[PDB]
RNA sequence: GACGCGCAUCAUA
RNA sequence: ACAACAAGAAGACGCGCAUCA
């Protein structure tokens, strides 16, 4: 029919087309969703979704339009719950995290919109299906619809599903639902902990291995969810776990070990020790296992047992390490990645308790291994250990071995790894001033790496010197640092920008760490060489160069002449085009940095001349620069030039100067009480009903100034601006109404709530509706903040025949 | 929709708020303000020859339903 | 973030946890995205601090390298005594950008 | 046109008075609270004089004041609830002679409001938790513990909100090494603002609910709800555990009621009236404040009426239940806001208007000539006021 | 028709039931003595110069942030309890400098480019002159 | 309502 | 297994004008 053809055309518009067409189609379908109807629309959208050859883009658009139309139909989607679910369920098992989360959100929305009984009856026949994929999807759906509407709304159904006797599929599905609820909920199942523990406890002694394993996994999930509290709920579950530890073997043993490891931290010190002893009695013999997943499980169990505060250190050092360092430190362990990370974390936390020296002394000899992956693993191990424990316990016999190992590791590398430089920096920083006798070796090594092999490790060497400049300075060394600086100086002109950025960062770090007047190359010889670098289009080089320029301008300014600053300014005006926020902020800051040294006469003229870009990005940066230079200099030397530029008939210039005034008033803060009289006529002229943008900017200026001048008692001029701000409330554009609301809330604290209440009490009960809505919104905004202050400003209302509206308690006279 | 401060807070009105609701809300707020401060309570207990406990008890009773019955 | 109207704050009883900020947004205010005069410390509820959500950034959600702060204007207006500033909405802009980035490469 | 504020005399209006071992020594001290000035003073048993040792301004209205100590501790930490939207814990350093802030938690907006907690403050007598509540809809509970560094800590607040509820008083129930309990006089008004006929205002009794803090479950749940036949004003904590039965005392007009959860029946005892009273018989009688002397051998209570009569409430109990409530006329003093019964027979009377008195307890009134009163007597009682002859005046402020 | 302006606003925090401008001690200037309903007696004193007023304002500004109140209540917000403060300097906050930590007192002194012995004398001089 | 164009706002990334 | 990331470029808005039914 005609409706079907219209839905076809709009669906084609949504599927393929330009973004404006797609958004127009979306807005019109949201506007007319109720009129279109649900039956044909769903019968029309479902076949496209069920097609297996659907691309992800149109699938996402269809899901979005379904979300947009779902909340409009509050109760008209009840018969369609089954037909939408049978198409939407498979989206929760995909590996796409965003797809999974939006599927969970849409199923939660559908559960909230629909009814409990209808969807429960819909998913009753899904429990006994023989396919395991559909059972898993049904378990996920039950978990999300239990997160929606609350757990107690589904609690009675759990007893029915878990007490089924005809088959174990229902019990397994119920346990899976429980574990998924525990996983997806988080810490919100704490009030309903016992109600789940009692219902799940009976499954630990069943004759089926699947139900026992799934019950153990769900108990582990519950213990994970209730990490710091809940031992009283699990006190009745411990004994079956210990009974099943010895009897079970294989996957069930892994599940039981995971569960018991999760429950160990919840106990007290004495109980934790008493039970971890028995855990260790089997753990020692269980470290020998062929499967990698069992190795990961036992590593997690060891980690959790070591994390308990009830286990004392002597038992750890007497039992756990001698087999740990002999079984878990091999090449095959470093071959994998999950075992990689798990072993790294376990070793780090073990070192956090037994002692860094014992851990480190047996693995420093591992740095000489030929394998690159094993060297990486051990290097991360010491790096993480020294990141937390420092290097206050390491001894000289160990320090020299560590230095030899790290130097050997850095000398030869198969590829470029940042882990080597990160670890080297961490060890050097942790050692502190005791690495002094090894500085020449480090300097020679970094020079040798920087001097050859064609710009592959030169950037890493620059990073290393940037990291170690501080330690070389603290070790009372300046001459070789200056040699390195000058070497980087003749090594500044590279074609590759990637290494150029690193070298510039190294030079910046050298400038930061050492004095500017003691630098081996004179400061006057850098800026002429550095200016052509500003024209490069790469991001990192621009960042490093602008940071170095700002540092030089802030610190070294008496040396630099006032001739090249103009060229630097004309280059920074172009550099403001950069996309990244950091570069723009640095340029804006260095504008004020250089205008502090140089009189703000030529700087202001250059900035004011570039306010007609027609590109919004440049004008905002220019006006922020104007504000920051005005703040840095004396405000009375920069105001008249700004005001004289307002007379230009270009609206962009007026918007820019108004924004500059707003930012300047925000920056100065309490200093605005002296210049408030100057900008009053300009704000009065701007607040007139001529354009929306000008009124919005004037409202922002008023808000910022009122917030700044609070606490001084200058309401004589502030009250005059309220008479012009108030008529601008009746507007429909979101931006202007937001600005007006912000201005009113800023003025509320500056003028007092009495004037605002008097203004609001004019048409609070006006016969119209929109004005009443606006006045009530303003009254609520005033009422939320400083509610107690409204007691003394309430008007007197005379009582009627039936009610008493007079507060007689305040009429008492002494 | 950043209006969460208005809906969650108690006492905020809207278009369909009657005069009686606003009056009773402001009366309850005034009673709470009287109870909170100490010098206002002293003034109330000096103006009429009573005790602080008696004044507090009377203010508790007056908070059940002021401004008479609703219409 | 005032720029995006569709973002929704958690708005719950703040606990004793400390908010975190990544390197991308270091000195920004959690409410008005200002850059001047940090005043107080940001606290978040225990729901926003659990497992994988511990140490994450407040606005975007990157790794935490610095603490979050309130500016002076927010403190004067007493906007800090509202709740945790953690944003619970994923945001339609980020997922959409990821979606037309993935297909193009 | 610029002024400067100078202060010559400080406020002398006592609002809240507490006692405890704040310095940590073996001498009791009193921390009195003015409208906005916090003051510390201690009596001298030798010369019988009171001298101020500390006076600091807090710049705000102190709406509540309580003292407590940790399990097995020897020092008392002061909890102050003010008009601001935060709760602070203070400790007194004898060497520094200044107040040091220990903790600071913010839970809402500042200023005296309706749904902002701070008006009512109750603490667990054991010292494992504290409770703060507002006039309506908002209650908060903070759990306190100590780490291995012997420093006091605090956890996240626990929500105990209840819409459409007018709280009259909040007091902590003493239990023996069990979950903390709090008793409050809740009162609903949702139905009173719906029916315009007017009968909803009347026949609206207030209940007495109990709140349980589940340490293992980390949440608060309502246990019971017991409606009352009449209107009460405040509650008194009867010591429990090994010293006396656990329960609360409810003070109302012309009556006092003991109530406990479980199988304990209610006990009702009338308040004695003055002989040949010239007052209007329509006027009622209520209590203004109460004290407690937890002596190791046997404990009693002290209460004051509107006319300033001091009574001595004694509870006679069985192995688990309580039999009767005994009242005894003690003395007559000017009407006060709060009493502090110190050790070694020191009674502090902080009058609401006028000078402050310090009384020395010389006799306990054992085997007095005048008879006593009890709830077992069927059917109203009368007594004859007489000079003190039981307390001796020592110091006047 | 002809409205009147307000040149002073403050919030003592206590109900005032008396106001009188008179001389307290012989050989001294006039002052505005007010008594409250709680038992406190206070006076309002005008400044003698502008440098002293600026110094007092700077001391108050420094102590507002550097020395927060005991109960964590904003001093400026407390004094602006109903109406914003106008041309009044709080002496109670300024006179708390004596109980401050010695290192913090030093830091404040070299922030003000003065010495604590001179600051104490300056603080006590205004009290001695008018009382 | 449909097919288009121009200008302008959010220190938007 | 519940598990967050890489720069072919995008998110919310508004004010005006041409044509057609
Ligand atoms: Zn949160
Ligand atoms: Zn971030
Ligand atoms: Zn802010």
XYZ file of N, CA, C and O and ligand atoms in Angstrom, chain C residues 20-25 57-62, ligand 2:
49
model
N 40.210 10.273 38.194
C 41.458 10.285 37.448
C 41.248 10.933 36.088
O 40.155 10.883 35.518
N 42.313 11.548 35.576
C 42.306 12.192 34.270
C 43.490 11.695 33.454
O 44.594 11.532 33.982
N 43.253 11.459 32.167
C 44.301 10.989 31.277
C 45.124 12.166 30.757
O 44.941 13.319 31.158
N 46.053 11.866 29.846
C 46.924 12.905 29.306
C 46.197 13.791 28.300
O 46.531 14.973 28.166
N 45.208 13.243 27.590
C 44.495 14.026 26.584
C 43.754 15.199 27.216
O 43.781 16.317 26.690
N 43.088 14.963 28.344
C 42.372 16.002 29.083
C 42.958 16.056 30.491
O 42.537 15.308 31.379
N 39.805 7.145 33.268
C 39.525 8.568 33.182
C 38.029 8.826 33.345
O 37.189 7.949 33.124
N 37.701 10.053 33.738
C 36.325 10.404 34.082
C 35.500 10.723 32.841
O 34.426 10.152 32.635
N 35.982 11.632 31.997
C 35.185 12.091 30.861
C 35.215 11.072 29.728
O 34.177 10.534 29.326
N 36.405 10.791 29.196
C 36.508 9.900 28.044
C 36.656 8.443 28.473
O 35.892 7.577 28.036
N 37.634 8.153 29.328
C 37.783 6.807 29.844
C 39.120 6.155 29.556
O 39.220 4.925 29.526
N 40.154 6.963 29.340
C 41.486 6.446 29.130
C 42.177 6.126 30.440
O 41.608 6.292 31.523
Zn 40.530 11.711 29.589
